Design a protein around this ligand. Structure first.
Ligand SMILES: CC#CCn1c(N2CCC[C@@H](N)C2)nc2c1c(=O)n(Cc1ccccc1C#N)c1nccn21
Ligand SMILES: CC#CCn1c(N2CCC[C@@H](N)C2)nc2c1c(=O)n(Cc1ccccc1C#N)c1nccn21
Ligand SMILES: *[C@@H]1O[C@H](CO)[C@@H](O[C@@H]2O[C@H](CO)[C@@H](O)[C@H](O)[C@H]2NC(C)=O)[C@H](O)[C@H]1NC(C)=O
Ligand SMILES: *[C@@H]1O[C@H](CO)[C@@H](O[C@@H]2O[C@H](CO)[C@@H](O)[C@H](O)[C@H]2NC(C)=O)[C@H](O)[C@H]1NC(C)=O
Ligand SMILES: *[C@@H]1O[C@H](CO)[C@@H](O[C@@H]2O[C@H](CO)[C@@H](O)[C@H](O)[C@H]2NC(C)=O)[C@H](O)[C@H]1NC(C)=O
Ligand SMILES: *[C@@H]1O[C@H](CO)[C@@H](O[C@@H]2O[C@H](CO)[C@@H](O)[C@H](O)[C@H]2NC(C)=O)[C@H](O)[C@H]1NC(C)=O
Ligand SMILES: *[C@@H]1O[C@H](CO)[C@@H](O[C@@H]2O[C@H](CO)[C@@H](O)[C@H](O)[C@H]2NC(C)=O)[C@H](O)[C@H]1NC(C)=O
Ligand SMILES: *[C@@H]1O[C@H](CO)[C@@H](O[C@@H]2O[C@H](CO)[C@@H](O)[C@H](O)[C@H]2NC(C)=O)[C@H](O)[C@H]1NC(C)=O
Ligand SMILES: *[C@@H]1O[C@H](CO)[C@@H](O[C@@H]2O[C@H](CO)[C@@H](O)[C@H](O)[C@H]2NC(C)=O)[C@H](O)[C@H]1NC(C)=O
Ligand SMILES: *[C@@H]1O[C@H](CO)[C@@H](O)[C@H](O)[C@H]1NC(C)=O
Ligand SMILES: *[C@@H]1O[C@H](CO)[C@@H](O)[C@H](O)[C@H]1NC(C)=O
Ligand SMILES: *[C@@H]1O[C@H](CO)[C@@H](O)[C@H](O)[C@H]1NC(C)=O
Ligand SMILES: *[C@@H]1O[C@H](CO)[C@@H](O)[C@H](O)[C@H]1NC(C)=O
Ligand SMILES: *[C@@H]1O[C@H](CO)[C@@H](O)[C@H](O)[C@H]1NC(C)=O
Ligand code: NA
Lengths: 728, 728
């Protein structure tokens, strides 16, 4: 008899999903790290050569974290001494190895504790950030040119983002943008002078006698936000004698009237740059198109070339205004914008014209623009079979928009319904990446006639290993609420019997633009729950979920903690009424936004759920950051939305926790959703005489990702779900 | 069937212990609060009068926290706006009410945010601390005289103690001492400049957007300690001089050689003060006796009057060197010191002779000196029946030491074995306060003849209530370990059957000078557990315990976390041998030092215990304060005792916790035993893969004493014990 997928299998990664992460270096070749060696692959034929041997740095004296080959293939940036900061930020030490003269560079080295580093897009110049200031290196063995002198820790950030812009704006620490050929270097400067500081204890190793206090400039909803300036420097006209001159591009008058943000930077051509600015009330945005004036040496942003993007029903973009995709001449562009029916589609714009032309339409949405040529635009969309949880690669003929070709739909319909893509420099080749419903499949294709060149990775090994395992299945379907269909997914136990009552665990995210019902193949905690414990694990996408139009997505506008909470209950209420679900054994679990939703559901007084687990939950919107919270909630002032901020808390619902079993988990060093949020939930339940289970994780952050902690969290939650469902 | 003593009875205080709190205003009168009215009682006849009617402060506009009448009974200090700080410290607003004029004082008011206030011991002079500076009022409506100008928040403390002096040295916030007739005001000044800060978060009400960081000067073991200086000012000179001089009394040269402490201040006469100094290595103490020199305005301490108190086996005193009791003339004093056998007895000294005469002796100890008259000295001791857990009042004739009467022994021997006393101003009358083994009994006696005047409170109301309740019983006995008697107590369930096997809960303290095996009557959590859950709640006084000689008390000197831990394991084994204990159902629980012993016991690998609860435990000696830790452990340096500090941590035993069910509980705003200690236990358990139960109490301190958190903690603990013992 065959084994089940156990907790130890999930925790020890017994069953590994094989990947194929390649790095395009031209229109014809990619790099692939095989057996610790870097190899060069000709996409057309499949043949390789050794680019770099694993033995090359055996006598290095440091464990190399990562590598970054210069665009010209002449130099290798060696990353070591990695110290993680936030989600994307880190400091490390760098060394440059000359690939041609087979020797490390010992002259003018990149300093230690370097905040960010990047090769120019072409050649081998380097831009780097150290002690909050930007430095440029025209050649690796040559002295650096200092670009900024204003850099100050926790106050003035140049070429790097502060806490909020990293997390909610650029999803990156870098605030550097090189021009296509690397002539110009564009950067953002952040000022956090009056932004209040989130403070928390850090315990460190047992040896630290007194705990350390961590102080992060973090703007909570309604607090003073950072300020932003935008600059462009010419890296071709740098001097050793004279200090560098940075040209400032100011925000439009429409933004300068009040609080705003820089939300997108995208070069159009070698001398044209686009910028998107977003107001603190995230329903108004402005794009500026800025050209380099060779005579004056200034960057002029014509008013005729401004583009207003706005929303009357909600905020702008899924999480922020979308990225424009400029043509070779940069005189026109393509951008995903929400249409008149509230569905996200590609619009075509002229730089000097107000009206744009939608090139796509329908009751589905475009996920992203992936590649652009003079003949075709390539994009991902959830159009195929009307499944909002599916993803496929499409090409639209730019001369005849009626000529839309799906490139992945029919490749393998049974195994592959969720795709991502990666194109070569001029889109000659593409790698398709299938992530479900079947095991991941990686393939290489060529754009000329959309030929299927070869299979890169098929995970056949994992398939052979999974043959001897009692694996769970996945049902993707929908329910109808108020004439609207909403999707759900259920991880069903092996040998599923529709004539038996199974306990049910509802796995929730339910945040704005979330999607928990999809065709992706996952090997996680829910796998073990269904495989070993015979628990149905369900997720549902109600109002406020994304990829289905603004009518659904904007339903929770100015009203977080309402519809998305109600809808989760209505979904569980419906599942309970199915013959195969044991209505006396229904549980709910969520992390981050899902933890807030889990806690609002447990305190709703619905009687549907027996128990629940909240991990690093948000408890009161006034405790979460400005950028995210205010996008959906607006400002927490009496003139704006203070009443909703006030009545959308977990705390006010404490009394309702009397008829449920609750497990509240949070890491002490969470810089994202501060421990404060959970400390306020516990205090409220204590205040109304409600018994619950609690677990803190010393020095753990939002991820609770340290190997020991990760094993500890899932062990502790497993015992709880098991005790709740009367399972041995 | 009769009801049991339930968890609700304990949490809701259904069965109330009546007290008799009187405040002696003279030699024959005391104050008593009956129905919110303050009555004055004539001790000789028991006849009263309303001293101050409940209606007196109806339209005051504030709830009065407490009152204090001036020694002469001309004024009443009304305390309101009570804001708690640490164990003894607080802030408050104060008003003075003229008893004569029956009017409130509206001029030259005591400021708001007053740290401490005290009347002169004679008359109506006032000394108070505001903003770390000492001020004096000769008259309540007249302007204050400023004494100090160095006062600085968290740096200089004049007249008030710092964290460590309040907690561990003086057991008071106060650091001002008036002379007997109020002419002089003596005070200590503490300098916390180089003292490191303990920083922790304070979440406060849900309305507080950003948590506040609480920063306290706190010396952990081996860190920089506060420095101290002592002064004396002639308050009678204030109205004749612009700025009266605070004369310094310097520490002796034997103290100035290194770090030391001021540990005792006692006035002997109108012009004579005694000071006790203690080295940071607490095994050497010095008493200086200082006389006022009328011609120089100086205080002089003669070397002929200097008394040395030292220890070769341990530290000086039980927790600090004891207080001297001077005879009227101030030419001699009585002091409790450790004798040649290691037992604490009363010594009689001449102020200028280094050799003292012991006035008491035997294999028992003197707990304290209560009153000193021209013919008699009154003291509490544990001599009666050789029970170290008992307490009685004795009378010794100063002209004949063979003349010792026990004033309390036989009054009610079945009901009363533990006593405390309160004497009138010149010891004319005494209130005896009996606390067990029967219901507490308060009686008033006269010293002229030692005759009982009347029963003040007998608890007949409670006795009537307790008759319809199945109450547990308490057994107090001993076991002979290595030729030594080691005492224990048991809270036995009702109808205790010697032939039955009962689950046992070992209730722990086990710190140096502890006593958990006594004769006090208590209505607590152990009452509920034994009464309702049929659990035997046992306590044991092993090596390191007090009131039994230095041989037992100093057994743990420089070795905390050893014998006192091992003896608790031995205790449980010996209990199992008694034949009425289920060896499969033995639990261990403790708070503070008890929390540490529980945790150390749970990580020993002994197999004796199934489960255990640790509340606000010490985990590593280097995290606890200097004064407590170093008294027993010395310094955490390689030349002293580092090896033992590093070997006595809970963390080093995290692997043996795999054998037990552990519950870890701590308050987040714990300024005494820092949350850091449980944050380091949990981390160590997570690292070695151990599952456990945790609970944090938001904004709760070492006492977890808020009405809500108290009920919450005992409810959570009860569930855990019941689960461990498989009780429904
Ligand atoms: C608090 C919050 C939030 C909202 N959030 C965001 N946002 C945009 C990026 C930046 C961030 N600050 C705010 N992305 C989010 C979430 C969010 O809750 N989950 C659920 C989630 C978080 C953690 C672990 C499991 C699960 C699951 N399942 C999630 N899953 C994938 C992406 N995401
Ligand atoms: C760490 C530590 C400690 C040692 N401690 C002290 N000290 C002297 C006074 C000043 C303080 N700073 C250190 N008194 C202590 C203790 C101590 O653990 N318990 C047990 C204890 C603490 C809290 C609750 C229940 C129990 C019970 N049962 C206790 N009970 C009565 C007095 N005490
Ligand atoms: C980065 O850090 C290392 C170590 O501090 C520096 O390398 C040398 O390392 C030795 C010890 O390994 C030290 O004595 C010196 O301070 C270092 N100096 C030199 C000149 O090699 C290194 O220099 C730092 N690198 C940069 C670019 O600042
Ligand atoms: C990248 O683009 C820049 C700007 O378009 C180019 O620089 C210009 O080149 C012409 C020379 O034919 C000069 O007359 C201009 O004055 C230059 N402009 C600036 C702003 O410096 C440059 O050729 C490009 N670099 C590469 C490597 O292709
Ligand atoms: C952006 O969203 C807001 C909030 O929903 C809208 O602002 C209005 O202005 C004030 C704010 O003080 C209120 O009196 C109004 O009632 C709000 N208008 C409404 C609700 O229609 C504003 O409409 C939005 N901007 C755009 C361009 O749609
Ligand atoms: C207790 O009783 C005695 C006796 O009545 C009171 O003593 C005082 O005695 C004088 C005799 O000249 C009476 O005129 C007064 O009534 C008493 N004086 C005062 C100041 O009260 C005494 O009052 C009683 N004690 C109390 C507290 O009421
Ligand atoms: C408290 O102690 C500190 C030192 O710990 C004293 O501050 C020093 O004062 C002298 C002047 O007397 C200065 O020259 C030094 O700069 C100071 N040292 C530090 C570490 O600050 C302080 O004077 C003492 N204060 C009182 C009022 O006794
Ligand atoms: C009263 O006397 C004290 C003690 O002599 C004065 O204290 C000194 O104040 C000066 C600065 O004004 C300093 O240089 C000394 O360090 C202080 N010494 C002490 C012991 O505090 C005080 O300022 C005087 N107050 C008035 C009102 O004159
Ligand atoms: C309280 O005691 C003090 C100190 O002995 C007394 O002050 C002395 O009074 C004597 C008179 O008997 C004088 O010779 C001195 O000038 C005083 N010395 C000092 C330092 O003040 C004080 O008078 C007593 N007060 C009362 C009210 O009894
Ligand atoms: C692959 O094969 C071609 C010959 O068709 C060769 O000349 C080319 O450089 C090779 N590429 C690699 C990456 O080995
Ligand atoms: C940052 O902003 C503060 C005001 O918030 C301002 O005074 C300061 O000049 C700024 N610094 C820079 C370098 O722009
Ligand atoms: C450039 O700017 C900084 C700070 O403003 C200055 O101190 C430095 O000396 C400058 N260098 C030159 C070469 O002018
Ligand atoms: C105390 O505070 C209140 C209000 O802040 C004020 O009305 C009063 O004057 C203060 N009293 C003193 C004695 O300073
Ligand atoms: C005080 O303690 C230390 C540490 O044990 C020791 O070396 C010293 O001799 C002791 N002093 C006395 C007076 O016993
Ligand atoms: Na092929």
């Amino acid at each position: 008899t065959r084994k089940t997928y156990t907790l130890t299998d999930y925790l020890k990664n017994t069953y590994r999903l094989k990947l194929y992460s390649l790095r395009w270096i031209s229109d014809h070749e990619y790099l692939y790290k095989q057996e610790n060696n870097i190899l060069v692959f000709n996409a057309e034929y499949g043949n390789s050569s050794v680019f770099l041997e694993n033995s090359t740095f055996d006598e290095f004296g440091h464990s190399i974290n990562d590598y970054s080959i210069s665009p010209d293939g002449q130099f290798i940036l060696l990353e070591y001494n990695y110290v993680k900061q936030w989600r994307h930020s880190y400091t490390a030490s760098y060394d440059i190895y000359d690939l041609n003269k087979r020797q490390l560079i010992t002259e003018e080295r990149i300093p230690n504790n370097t905040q960010w580093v990047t090769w120019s897009p072409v050649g081998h110049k380097l831009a780097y950030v150290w002690n909050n200031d930007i430095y440029v290196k025209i050649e690796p063995n040559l002295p650096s040119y200092r670009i900024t002198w204003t850099g100050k820790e926790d106050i003035i950030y140049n070429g790097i983002t502060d806490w909020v812009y990293e997390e909610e704006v650029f999803s990156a620490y870098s605030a550097l943008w090189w021009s296509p050929n690397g002539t110009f270097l564009a950067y953002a400067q952040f000022n956090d002078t009056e932004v209040p500081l989130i403070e928390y204890s850090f315990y460190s190793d047992e040896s630290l006698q007194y705990p350390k206090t961590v102080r992060v400039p973090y703007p909570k909803a309604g607090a003073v936000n950072p300020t932003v300036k935008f600059f462009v420097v010419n890296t071709d006209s740098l001097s050793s004698v004279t200090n560098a001159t940075s040209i400032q591009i100011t925000a439009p008058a429409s933004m300068l009237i009040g609080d705003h943000y820089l939300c997108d930077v995208t070069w159009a051509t070698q001398e044209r740059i686009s910028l998107q600015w977003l107001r603190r009330i995230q329903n108004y945005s402005v794009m500026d198109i800025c050209d380099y004036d060779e005579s004056s040496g200034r960057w002029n942003c014509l008013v005729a070339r401004q583009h207003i993007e706005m929303s009357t029903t909600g905020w702008v973009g899924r999480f922020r205004p979308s990225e424009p995709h400029f043509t070779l001449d940069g005189n026109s562009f393509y951008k995903i914008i929400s249409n008149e029916e509230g569905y996200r589609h590609i619009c075509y714009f002229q730089i000097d014209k107000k009206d744009c032309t939608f090139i796509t339409k329908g009751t589905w949405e475009v996920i992203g623009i992936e590649a652009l040529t003079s003949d075709y635009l390539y994009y991902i969309s959830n159009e195929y079979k009307g499944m909002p949880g599916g993803r496929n690669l499409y090409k639209i003929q730019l001369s005849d928009y009626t000529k839309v070709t799906c490139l992945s739909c029919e490749l393998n319909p049974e195994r592959c319904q969720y795709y991502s893509v990666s194109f070569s420099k001029e889109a000659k080749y593409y790698q398709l990446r299938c992530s479900g419903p079947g095991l991941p499949l990686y393939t290489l294709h060529s754009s000329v006639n959309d030929k299927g060149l070869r299979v890169l990775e098929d995970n056949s090994a994992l398939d052979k290993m999974l043959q001897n395992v009692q694996m769970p299945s996945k049902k993707l379907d929908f329910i109808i609420l108020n004439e609207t269909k909403f999707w759900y997914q259920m991880i069903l136990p092996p040998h599923f019997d529709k004539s038996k009552k199974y306990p049910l665990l509802l796995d929730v995210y339910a945040g704005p633009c979330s999607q928990k019902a999809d065709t992706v193949f996952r090997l996680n905690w829910a796998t073990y729950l269904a495989s070993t414990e015979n628990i149905i694990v369900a997720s549902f996408d109600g109002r406020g979920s994304g990829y289905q139009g603004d009518k659904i997505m904007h339903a929770i506008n100015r009203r977080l903690g309402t519809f998305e909470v109600e809808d989760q209950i209505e979904a569980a209420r419906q599942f309970s009424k199915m013959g195969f679900v044991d209505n006396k054994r229904i549980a709910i679990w969520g992390w981050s936004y899902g933890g807030y939703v889990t806690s609002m559901v447990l305190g709703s007084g619905s009687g549907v759920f027996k128990c629940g687990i909240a991990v690093a939950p948000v408890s009161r919107w006034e405790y979460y950051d400005s950028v995210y919270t205010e996008r959906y909630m607006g400002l927490p002032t009496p003139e704006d939305n203070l009443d909703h901020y006030r009545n959308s808390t977990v705390m006010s619902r404490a009394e309702n926790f009397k008829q449920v079993e609750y497990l509240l988990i949070h890491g002490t060093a969470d810089d994202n959703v501060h421990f404060q949020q959970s400390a306020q939930i516990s205090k409220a339940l204590v205040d109304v005489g409600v018994d619950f289970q609690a677990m803190w994780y010393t020095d753990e952050d939002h991820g609770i990702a340290s190997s020991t902690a990760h094993q500890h969290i899932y062990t502790h939650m497993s015992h709880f779900i098991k005790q709740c469902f009367s399972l041995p």
